[PDB]
Amino acid sequence: EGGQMPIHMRLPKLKGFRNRFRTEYEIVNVGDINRLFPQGGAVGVDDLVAKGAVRKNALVKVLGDGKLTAKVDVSAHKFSGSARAKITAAGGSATE
Amino acid sequence: PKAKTHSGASKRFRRTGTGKIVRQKANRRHLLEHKPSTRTRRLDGRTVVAANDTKRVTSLLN
RNA sequence: UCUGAUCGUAUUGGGCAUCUAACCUCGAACCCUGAAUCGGGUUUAGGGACAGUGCCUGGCGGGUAGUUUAACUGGGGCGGUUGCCUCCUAAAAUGUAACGGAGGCGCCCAAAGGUUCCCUCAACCUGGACGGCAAUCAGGUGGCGAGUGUAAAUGCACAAGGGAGCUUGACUGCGAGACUUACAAGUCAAGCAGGGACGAAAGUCGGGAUUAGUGAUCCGGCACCCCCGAGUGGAAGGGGUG
RNA sequence: AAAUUCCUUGUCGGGUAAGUUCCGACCUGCACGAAUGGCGUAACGACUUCUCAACUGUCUCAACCAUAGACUCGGCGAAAUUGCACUACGAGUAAAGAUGCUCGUUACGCGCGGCAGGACGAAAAGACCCCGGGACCUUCACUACAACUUGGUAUUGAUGU
RNA sequence: UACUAAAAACACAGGUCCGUGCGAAGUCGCAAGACGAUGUAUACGGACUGACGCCUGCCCGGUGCUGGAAGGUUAAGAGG
RNA sequence: CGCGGCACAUCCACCUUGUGGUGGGUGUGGGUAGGGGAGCGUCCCUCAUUCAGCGAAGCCACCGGGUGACCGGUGGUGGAGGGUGGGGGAGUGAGAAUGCAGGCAUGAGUAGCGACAAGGCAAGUGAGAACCUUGCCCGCCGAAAGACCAAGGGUUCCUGGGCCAGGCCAGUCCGCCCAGGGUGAGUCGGGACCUAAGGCGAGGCCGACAGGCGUAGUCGAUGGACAACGGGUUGAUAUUC
RNA sequence: AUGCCGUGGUGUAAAGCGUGGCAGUGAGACGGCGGGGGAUAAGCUCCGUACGUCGAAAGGGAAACAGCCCAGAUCGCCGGC
RNA sequence: GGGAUGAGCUGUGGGUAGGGGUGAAAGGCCAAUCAAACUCCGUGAUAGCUGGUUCUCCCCGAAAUGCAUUUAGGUGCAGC
RNA sequence: UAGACGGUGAGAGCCCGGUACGCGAAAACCCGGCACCUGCCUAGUAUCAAUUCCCGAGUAGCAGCGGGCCCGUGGAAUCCGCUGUGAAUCCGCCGGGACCACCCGGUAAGCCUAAAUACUCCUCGAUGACCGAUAGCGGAUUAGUACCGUGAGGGAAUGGUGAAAAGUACCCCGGGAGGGGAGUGAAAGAGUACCUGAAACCGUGUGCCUACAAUCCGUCAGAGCCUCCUUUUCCUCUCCGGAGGAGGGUGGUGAUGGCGUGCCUUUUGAAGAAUGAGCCUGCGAGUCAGGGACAUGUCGCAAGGUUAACCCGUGUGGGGUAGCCGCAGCGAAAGCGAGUCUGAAUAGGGCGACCCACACGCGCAUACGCGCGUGUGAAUAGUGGCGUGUUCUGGACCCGAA
RNA sequence: AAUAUAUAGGGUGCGGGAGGGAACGCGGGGAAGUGAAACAUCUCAGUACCCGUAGGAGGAGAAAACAAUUGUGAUUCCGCA
RNA sequence: AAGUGUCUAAGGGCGCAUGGUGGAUGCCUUGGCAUCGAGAGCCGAUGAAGGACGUGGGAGGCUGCGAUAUGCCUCGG
């Protein structure tokens, strides 16, 4: 600064810590599934990365964001409850 | 050749999902008897960085 | 069987003495030196498990080494000061400096807080034994001079002063919305929920009549919450709240 | 009253005519003092300081002469310095002191020899002061170290007590 | 003190005090190994003073040196 | 205010009725540090085009031109690489740093011209002479301004020859330049003989290493040992022949 | 009295606010009006003013003159007020 | 002017070398410089200070004020 | 299959030396084929039991003082060295971040090991949007020379004649040098002191002004001379010319008057008696690397975009998805997820979602717009490259301290 | 040999070494300036410099290694992370 | 008698013409800086790197050379 205690030292250290074992998952928006696959047919990791909607070499979760009408089973992991509700409301099925 | 990030800045400031920076206020770690629960409520939280120094901070973290 | 004392006995060390055996001996003699007083070796004499040397540790340590040793400042120096609070200077919103004028603070309170209820002092005059104009008592004047925990201001008689009963809100989880301010930081907050003291209730209370009574950051410690737990289960350590 | 005394030329007296110095004495020692040595001491000293005979151009009070320079003539031929130039003075103004600005006065252009008042004259990035930075130095400053030093263990045993 | 200061500074003789019993202390060196010295307490090293004469007074409280080790405090180690 | 010319914002009407410009009107236009926008010029590369020994560039002068950084043309010198345009890329624009390297000025034909020993004259050499030469006077040191060694210098000695430069002037001469010649040792001073102070110092000790000290042995003179004296000569050498 | 906050009309090419990028300033002087220190002082010094000017502004006038008075230069004119 | 048979002067040859040497001590002398010599290397060191920064045009246009400073001759945020 | 450069009297494919291209090895030497030479091997494989033995000794590990590992002694792993104590031989040992147990991986304390990789004094060949003699290394020239310093070390400046030397024979001044006349040469304006020959500077000639007058040394007014020049009376000598004169007009000088305190730096304030500059010439100071970072203009694509390293290939083209930014955030984290967190709940509040000129169906509303599906086309984006301005680390605008 | 073995030493003979080398590498040693607007911890840096000692390249190396159940299976070097 | 009244340059200034010194700009290079590709990546007790000395028909330096001395022998072009 030039004459006083820098803002860095002045302020408190931000609380908390970072885990080393934070197995972060990628995100698939079920609405994006709706517009991407209105025909249903087949859904899976390979197809999603083939479209380029999600990163490779990682597990994916499904969001409750979006109106789902396409009746198709989804091959993926760690669906939220709202994802299962939307999936079975359309008439599809979750994997694990 | 390759940039550096000011460590203390990285250990005090947190960038949010958008273009905002927050500060953990914690003038509440030394002496707390004369400070009431009211003042501690005032300090408690993560307030937004003042716009009179974001223009410096963003280069401190980047 | 507080087992003093104590037989000797397992252990152990210390101390002491003695002994020679490592080791030392610019102590002697001889020899590879007929070219040597260095050196190395044989034998002998004497010191001796010491000392010295390596490791670890305490201590003395300007002999030597690297730096600091503040600033403002009516030049410097000496002197004196440095944060916070209150008044004036301040020019009638606020703000507004000077080695310009004046004073306090680095505390206090489980009652001097909160609540309900009640009262209005001082100074003055009259009368009054111990008692005096100078404690106490009555009467009359007296709408605030007294008082305000503490400096000063500002306000307080509707009383924030005084007296008394019960009590701990001297709480928890939040707090829209503002002032002020470069920033950090400070200040106020109706009102909401829990639960509860007071109060017949309506209602007040998230400390002191408000303004000073304090000090950011890092690191570390205490209690609690499985929050994580370097293969795993645990643990350490870390994390979160006070 | 001094190598030691600011108040102070302290006071008395000789020395001088006249002595803030000197010599001698008192002590009212701001501050004398015993090995960071006190008090004396013949001889000594390119030391310091006061007085005196003699002489003297040190002055009164300056003057003359000679010599190598200066000056001229011929030859060789530098330099520091250097904002420009056809470089007056006074009273004033102005960043306070003006050649350069205003109003006035005065001077024919040029050139040689002398003086040295000025041009904040030249040579030097103030050699006093202050601030910042660095060196060096001392120490009951702080933190470390070498060295000397203490203890234990090993090198290192036995016999006894 | 060449290159501003030659002195009232320095230095010696003399006088005191302290240390060392000998590959000594001290110093130079990390050690070896040298000096000190082919010497050794009437010698050597260090400090102050500075012929000669008269003299050199009192205080060990502070800070240092030296001797002691009652007692307290006191690290590592052993033990734990 | 008037009479005229440029410019930026804005208003209005047109061209793509803001790509960007065209026509008109109002108001605006001092400005340092400093922000923004558009520009001038030099060198090189690429592409296209193009002048040029019937004379390019650079340079000098002249006449004109743009609002500016600047340009064009004409003439002369000189004699071989440059112009126009769109692009790319910069060691890119000097007026100062008591700046650097080079060159040249003022001061200035001034000061200074190098001990308080002293030169003078005649003849001669020579284009030229106070300074060299040959004669003759005068003057000076004479325990040094004389004569010899070392150290040091390292051809500076001699002869012949030259006088652009140097010498604090000139200067036929010189310790300046060129060519050539010249230094003779059993006995002088050194090695062939040792040695002191002291250095190297295998072996050896110590030290992480590099390395340090030091014995033997060997080096190291101004020292100790060791045999020579006089005279003559050449342009020069001499206890040397 | 001034001054200040806020509101409603009016007038003015337009200033302002928030948001990003790049700088400077962070020594100020004098004069006018109010004030303290100082002596009723200073070309003194420390403050205040939505007071100016210089600084960064040329020109006129004050004899000359950075700070006062008038006056804010786009350029040219042998034109006026 | 002083010493000028003595602590003398001088030549030859030798040693001591940098936070070290030497020193009849002055803080001088060590290749004209010494309160730590010289050359090179790290080095293109550093400096809150000074000094210089090269061609033009057009528009617009500051401050010397507050808060904080091992700070007042600097810098940071704010103001313009 | 020769247009690569260069040389040759001015710019060369065909003039030359050369290149393309194709030849060329007695002797030596590196690699390489073959022979000799050299050297290993009269099998330990299959099976079973595990009573026996081994599997790297003053070592490991442990304690102590340290280094280094993101890791500064901190709870401190593993690795290394030093000092004392001092293990085991597979039912063992080490390690897996103090540590114990389980699980897993692997068997230290002996040795050797090519490739990928780092550098070019030095030797051929080649390039260069690098300089072209104050630059390039300092060294194009007697170069680490001369020179400075006892020494370690420091450390200069000087290029160009013309294609060819054709080097001015001869003559004349002059002591010579030097010069002149002739002459060579295209040119001597190419004479060893030599291409072009700048500026400061010195100097000659010449038009104008100047010896009674004070001012940064100029500007604006401005007289009269002088150079040049057009029209014209006129000289009619006139089929010539502008002689001279008037008038008019370029370019000098500029009598005399007004006006006006030099640049820069730094300063509250300067022409300065505040600093720096003697003049000229040349040189000399804001730039570069990095898929750095924020913002911006513009250009590719489009929920994408983009490759690095490395490979292939020849002019720098094509491959190459490992990786990065964006794509969902909050939260200390578990974990949850268009919500999430704190928290008893959250009514509240922190971060982020989704803003309609609005129709269909429809709750709400007189009108004004809220909402769920479809839609009157409702609101929309980053990424990569090249410049700009800034900034971090790199000597970082440049020079200079002790 | 010294003293008896015997050894150190001595003697004879046969091989190799030292020193140079611009840069690069390995092992060992080891500052300050500077930054931190002071400054010791820290950095600058295990750099400058030095010593040892090779090579044409060297060094390292063939698991008492990683991960933590997809498992891989010597080293070195570049780019990611 | 009074009044009007041109002229001079010892030497400067300004501008032109014509010359000197000096050696800058322009074009050039027998010379260099930095790089890609390919070799070589060592020499030396067999006396090396590097040097003094000395050698040529005629002063001296560089270059090459070493009492066989700007060279000798042999096989090659």
TrEMBL record, chain B:
It comes from the Bacteria. Residues 1-21 are annotated as: Disordered. One of its GO terms (biological process) is translation. Pfam families: Ribosomal_L35p. GO terms for cellular component: cytosolic large ribosomal subunit. Signal peptide: none annotated. SUPFAM superfamilies: L35p-like. One of its GO terms (molecular function) is structural constituent of ribosome. InterPro entries: Ribosomal_bL35, Ribosomal_bL35-like, Ribosomal_bL35_CS, Ribosomal_bL35_sf. Keywords: Ribonucleoprotein, Ribosomal protein. HAMAP family: Ribosomal_bL35. Belongs to the bacterial ribosomal protein bL35 family. NCBIfam families: rpmI_bact (TIGR00001). PANTHER family: 54S RIBOSOMAL PROTEIN BL35M, LARGE RIBOSOMAL SUBUNIT PROTEIN BL35M. This is Large ribosomal subunit protein bL35. It comes from Mycobacterium tuberculosis. The gene is rpmI.
